[PDB]
Amino acid sequence: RNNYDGDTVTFSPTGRLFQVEYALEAIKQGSVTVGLRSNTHAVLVALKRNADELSSYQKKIIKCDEHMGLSLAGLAPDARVLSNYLRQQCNYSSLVFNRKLAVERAGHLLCDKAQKNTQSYGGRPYGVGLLIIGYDKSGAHLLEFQPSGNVTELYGTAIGARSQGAKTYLERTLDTFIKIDGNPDELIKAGVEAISQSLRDESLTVDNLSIAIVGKDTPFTIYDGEAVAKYI
Amino acid sequence: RYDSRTTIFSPEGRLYQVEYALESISHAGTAIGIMASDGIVLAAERKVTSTLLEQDTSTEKLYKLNDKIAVAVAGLTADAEILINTARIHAQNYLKTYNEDIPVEILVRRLSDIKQGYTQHGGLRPFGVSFIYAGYDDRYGYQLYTSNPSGNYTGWKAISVGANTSAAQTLLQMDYKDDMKVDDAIELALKTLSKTTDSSALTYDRLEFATIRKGANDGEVYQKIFKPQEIKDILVKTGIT
């Protein structure tokens, strides 16, 4: 029992909710992205999906700001409500305080917003993971936002389908990319290797790659076509 | 089952809720309004009675909503109180606004929209009440209507609701004389009331009555809820007492 498979306002005997648990499922059916970072750069590499070969592929990179940006893996409807919210906060910090919003500080606002819908009986709870990059005063940071609202600062992480091989690339090469600083080229190449292994019964193509980069010297820029056929 | 909210429909394309309100009428008292060219009578039957019940200095199923229009009640009495008060408020708005008394067709029409509104909107009951409207307006003269618990109205020259509607109706339409008289309305009503009621001797303390007349003390309408001893006079003519 599983009288709790309907209630999001009523604890399940384990101390969880099933709704929060199913939300992790949504991420698994969701599209793969690999994060990683260094002190002076942070990179998101994401897989575009298609339903056919007359599709011109789904944007998996949304520009939140000109120095911050996010990627998604899971429910695209839920991803939209939180993207709206997230841009509203970064612009607020540039309006009133002439300030960049820290990666970590943004994440704590998103936390209250997940758990509000858990507390309530109204509207959908979330079911998308966001990999967040930014570059603030405290250099590049990489957060993994969960639909629970738990925000976790790592040197590399991955969410989406078949994401357990990205964690294995990253663990081995953890230190290689701490030592590289000031070379955007190197950090971009490392995500690409990462997501080949993640995937199974697929191969990468040119227009499946969307690489989004910000650092201390690199402005927030998205590379497509000929700007990502140099690292395939 | 369909019972949870009134925002649903049964497979007849009506709602089961409407059927339940219908049935509420047929466990209350019997009510009859017979229209004639010379006055309209309203009649209701009491559904409780005792000898330590005060019912000789009062009525409960008869309200005047303005001095030209009156209503009878059949249904639960608990349901009744709220909607009477609103019809009467709507009448005095009409009086305030237009400087004249409301038409019968609108007053009923409003009330019918309001019943339907509680079906239409929310999980709030339908109100299982049938009211007999007997009115006057100088546009269609005397007007007799009744209002459904579903919330629609239909014009009439005689009608019965309450308990044993079918039994009552056949009996009313049989003895309907085509010019009609207010005196014959009054006479017919007692006769019809008797046979439905489960008492064999109908009595005035068991009766509520109002007759509406403009055919005596012309140029003006005077509506009179009868006093108990007068009701006794009309019973003696029909030979019941």
């Binding site: 009288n3 999001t8 306002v9 009523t10 604890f11 399940s12 005997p13 384990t14 101390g15 969880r16 909710l17 704590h108 936390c111 209250d112 997940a114 758990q115 858990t118 507390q119 309530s120 009986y121 109204g122 969960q146 629970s148 609202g149 738990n150 925000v151 976790t152 600062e153 790592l154 040197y155 590399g156 992480t157 964690k167 990253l170 663990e171 953890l174 | -």
Partner: protein, 245 residues
């Protein structure tokens, strides 16, 4: 079970408990060990933040968060859910400062937080909290240590403990009443906090941990709360490892 009684938070059992509030307490148990130790001149808070992979960045994820500059709070259970009780807590703190032009007394804070948990059981459309919160500081009356339950029950403590390795902690806290009937002084309690969390980490053993300690002490942190970091924390680490061995 059935017949209500846990199916909503309004409904009550014939026993005198609520089995939906019992599963919330189970969620505090599952969360990572936190302790707080009251002293005759301060409070020390410690937390076990376990390391699951070395992909985490060390000293960057914690359950220690500050309120004003002199009330420390630390939470166990559901991680984002403990964050939120601190986020509202912070709002409540500010109101009091603006209106009365004074820092909040710790028992005053203690009343105000537990009213938030209680509001979330009066409504069947609000899921309770499922977090315990160890808290305290130094104020007008000196140092005070409290802990709050996800029931919405709270009381003052000399030593408090919550989480998964709380079975060890409780035992070390007791050894302390006997050892010191002052509950230990605030300086030596930073080292006492580290040793406690190490015996507690024997109940989580299959994994590594990261230990964060913070403090607030009357005249050895100057009435203010600040994070124990630096050469301070490493001394605390060395004491723990030595005496466990």
């Amino acid at each position: 079970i059935g017949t209500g009684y846990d199916l909503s938070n309004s409904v009550f059992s014939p026993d005198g408990r609520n089995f939906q509030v019992e599963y919330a307490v189970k969620a505090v148990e599952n969360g990572t060990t936190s302790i707080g130790i009251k002293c005759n001149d301060g409070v020390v808070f410690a937390v076990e933040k376990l390391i699951t992979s070395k992909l985490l960045v060390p000293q960057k994820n914690v359950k220690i968060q500050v309120v004003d500059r002199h009330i420390g709070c630390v939470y166990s259970g559901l991680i984002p859910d403990g964050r939120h009780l601190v986020n509202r807590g912070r709002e409540e703190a500010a109101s009091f400062k603006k209106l009365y032009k004074t820092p909040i007394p710790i028992p005053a804070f203690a009343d105000r937080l537990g009213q938030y948990v209680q509001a979330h059981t009066l409504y069947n459309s609000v899921r309770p909290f499922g977090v315990s919160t160890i808290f305290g500081g130094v104020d007008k009356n000196g140092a005070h240590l409290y802990m709050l339950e996800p029931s919405g029950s709270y009381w003052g403590y000399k030593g408090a403990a919550t989480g998964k390795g709380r079975q060890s902690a409780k035992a070390e806290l007791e050894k302390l009443v006997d050892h010191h009937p002052e509950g230990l002084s605030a300086r030596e309690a930073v080292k006492q906090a580290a040793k406690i969390i190490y015996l507690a980490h024997e109940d989580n053993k299959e994994k590594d941990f990261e230990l964060e300690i913070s403090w607030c002490s009357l005249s050895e942190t100057n009435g203010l709360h600040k994070f124990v970091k630096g050469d301070l924390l490493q001394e605390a680490i060395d004491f723990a490892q030595k005496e466990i061995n």
